Every structure is written in structure tokens, then in C-alpha cells.
Design a protein around this nucleic acid. Structure first.
Ligand SMILES: Nc1ncnc2c1ncn2[C@@H]1O[C@H](COP(=O)(O)OP(=O)(O)OP(=O)(O)O)[C@@H](O)[C@H]1O
Length: 311
DNA sequence: CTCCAGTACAGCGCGGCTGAAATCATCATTAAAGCG
């Protein structure tokens, strides 16, 4: 098995230009906010499985590895909002995250704000990052709760720490609720999936950078004339499912004697990870499924919005 | 301060009533054909 090759095949990262555009903007946000005056407050979108958490873990690596190895400073922070977040609920988890506090046996929402606003200059927080903004909409109706939104405006105007919010593409109507939240968050971006399969894409260079990143030491055989056809036939532009199927083929090749990912084990990888796909999506690998041109069609605009049509 | 209970307020769903539209009855009127 040689589990080093397995973990080294799973932990692989390809920097598409949108990702480095993002990380450049967050360093821009980090040492552009001067902690004297009003911050910049970027907002990042992206659908399910487009690489968001990988982006922020890249960011806390390249921004906080040496400063977390040096001492208890914690300049950048990483937060997910729990579902249907009460303002005291999000505030207390954001508080027990940073520092070494006890911090949550009292739930009073004024005095823990006191403790968090005295601690946010005490350890020297350079940036606060929130992962999951779509948790503030109701399940069965599309009312949105902005107790946490006005609380986040309060902690923004209290201490001038920059905030970078990630979230689903349907989570922006929450920002359409509070207009002061809408104006305070100026930079919204678009981390949409891979666009086309027609040729000379960013998809190409991503694919062959992943190919040299793979643990097989000669060639992976991928990013070819017909392979990206069935690859884009399998995953829409969907980064998580593409990488998942690729990893599930790579483990199958390293289970036995195999020199590269080839045409006997990539099929069984299509057999496993075909579960999340819809019924009208077509299964292209086993016996005779040639792929029409309409099925490599680019992803629509409401690609991170199908959590929202039904209600 | 937190959990449980009571009680108010708000919301959704179901049922009943009312209104409108569609269909069927019902006959009435008009026209054509046959008989006187
Ligand atoms: N730049 C990249 N290069 C290689 N693989 C990547 C890249 N970005 C993401 N992946 C793969 O995609 C998978 C999904 O990553 P991630 O969870 O960050 O997406 P996401 O949009 O945050 O999904 P969710 O929002 O549901 O957490 C990861 O397992 C990772 O291996």
C-alpha cells in the first residue's frame, strides 16, 4: 500500500488563477486594513465542492505557519457558522476558537462581546475568516435571520478587524437583507466551476498540473484528446467529484500491479462515485457510451442556487 | 442563568361557503321539409 503514496496522492493542490487571485486579495485585505480606520471586508462565493476550504487552509498555511510555530499570536482565524446561528451561538464559538479561553459556560451576549473585543487586540488578530454564511437562511421558508448580521456589523465597527466571508451563491440574499452589510462588503467575487471542454482552457493546464502532481513517476495518461471528454462528461465542472473520481482511480491502480491509471480501473472508479449524480446525468464509461456535444455544455448561473428553488 | 410550562401571537393547512366558469338540461325559437 505504502500509505505515504496514498496521503501524498490525496493531498495534492493545483493553483488555478482564480485561487491565486483570491489569496492575493486576502493578503491585500490583511495588510491593507491598517487597524486604525474602516476595513475592506471582502466576500467570497462558490458552489458546493469548488475548493473553498482548501483555499483557506492554503491561506492559513502560507500566512500563519511560522507565526503559529513561534508563539500564541493567532493572527488569522478560521470560523464556520453553525446552523441557524444565534448571535450568542456564533459569538461563543468564535470566542472559544481563538486564544485559550473557557468562554462558553456563560451565554450572555454582552459580556462575551466585552471579552472578545478586549481579546481581539490582546492577541493581535490580523484577519477573521468565516466559512459558512448560508446557514442563516431558514430551511422551509426563505426568511433570513440577521441577528448575526447586525452583530457582525457591531463587531466590525467596534474593532476594525477585516472580515472575509465565504459562502454559497444563494447566500448573498442574506447580504441583501441588511443594506449596511451590503455596503460594508464591497468586494464580492465569483469562484464558479470549470467552464468548457472545447480546448485551450484553464481546465487543460489544471489537468496536466494534476497529472505531474500524481504519484505515478512516468505519466498519468490524462489530459488527452478523448480523456477530458469523458472527464467533463462525468463531473460538470465539479472540482470535488472530479478529484474524488481521480483519487478513487489512483488508489485502485496502486492496490495492485499497475503502472498508470488505465482503462480497467478508471471504470470501477466511475462505478463507485456515480451516486451523487442526478438521474438525467449520463454514465459514460462502461460499454459503449459516446458523449454528445450538448453534454459538455457549460454550467449555468444558478449552479449554487438549487438549494433555493423549492420554497 | 437555564430549562420547563403556560399563554399569546403568528402562520400554514384543511374545511366550508361563495362566486365564477364550464357543462349539461331543458326547452324555445327559427328555419326547412313534408303533408293538408
Ligand atoms: N486547487 C485544487 N487542486 C486540487 N484539488 C482540489 C483543489 N481545490 C479543491 N480540490 C479538491 O476538491 C475537494 C473539495 O474541496 P473543498 O471542500 O474545499 O470544496 P468546497 O467548495 O469548500 O466544498 P464545501 O463548500 O462543501 O466544503 C477537496 O477534497 C480537494 O481535494
Amino acid at each position: 500500500t505504502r500509505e505515504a503514496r496514498i496521503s501524498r496522492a490525496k493531498r495534492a493542490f493545483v493553483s488555478t488563477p482564480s485561487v491565486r487571485k483570491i489569496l492575493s486579495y486576502m493578503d491585500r485585505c490583511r495588510d491593507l486594513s491598517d487597524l486604525e480606520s474602516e476595513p475592506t471586508c471582502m466576500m467570497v462565493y462558490g458552489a458546493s465542492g469548488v475548493g473553498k476550504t482548501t483555499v483557506i487552509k492554503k491561506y492559513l498555511n502560507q500566512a500563519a505557519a511560522a507565526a503559529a510555530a513561534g508563539g500564541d499570536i493567532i493572527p488569522v482565524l478560521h470560523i464556520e457558522l453553525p446552523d441557524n446561528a444565534k448571535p450568542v451561538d456564533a459569538a461563543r464559538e468564535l470566542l472559544v476558537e481563538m486564544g485559550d479561553p473557557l468562554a462558553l459556560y456563560e451565554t450572555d451576549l454582552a459580556r462575551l462581546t466585552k471579552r472578545l473585543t478586549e481579546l481581539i487586540p490582546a492577541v493581535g488578530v490580523k484577519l477573521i475568516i468565516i466559512d459558512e454564511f448560508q446557514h442563516l437562511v431558514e430551511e422551509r421558508s426563505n426568511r433570513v435571520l440577521t441577528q448575526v448580521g447586525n452583530w457582525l456589523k457591531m463587531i466590525l465597527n467596534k474593532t476594525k478587524c477585516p472580515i472575509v466571508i465565504f459562502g454559497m451563491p444563494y447566500s448573498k440574499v442574506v447580504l441583501q437583507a441588511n443594506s449596511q452589510l451590503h455596503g460594508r462588503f464591497s468586494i464580492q467575487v465569483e469562484l464558479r466551476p470549470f467552464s468548457y471542454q472545447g480546448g485551450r482552457g484553464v481546465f487543460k493546464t489544471f489537468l496536466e498540473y494534476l497529472d505531474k502532481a500524481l504519484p505515478f513517476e512516468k505519466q498519468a495518461g490524462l489530459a488527452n484528446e478523448s480523456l477530458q471528454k469523458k472527464l467533463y462528461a462525468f463531473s460538470q465542472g465539479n472540482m470535488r467529484s472530479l478529484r474524488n473520481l481521480i483519487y478513487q482511480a489512483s488508489i485502485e491502480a496502486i492496490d495492485n500491479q499497475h503502472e498508470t491509471i488505465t482503462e480497467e480501473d478508471f471504470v470501477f472508479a466511475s462505478k463507485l462515485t456515480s451516486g451523487d449524480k442526478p438521474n438525467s446525468w449520463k454514465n459514460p464509461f462502461e460499454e459503449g457510451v459516446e458523449v454528445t456535444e450538448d453534454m459538455l455544455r457549460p454550467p449555468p448561473k444558478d449552479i449554487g442556487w438549487e438549494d433555493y428553488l423549492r420554497h
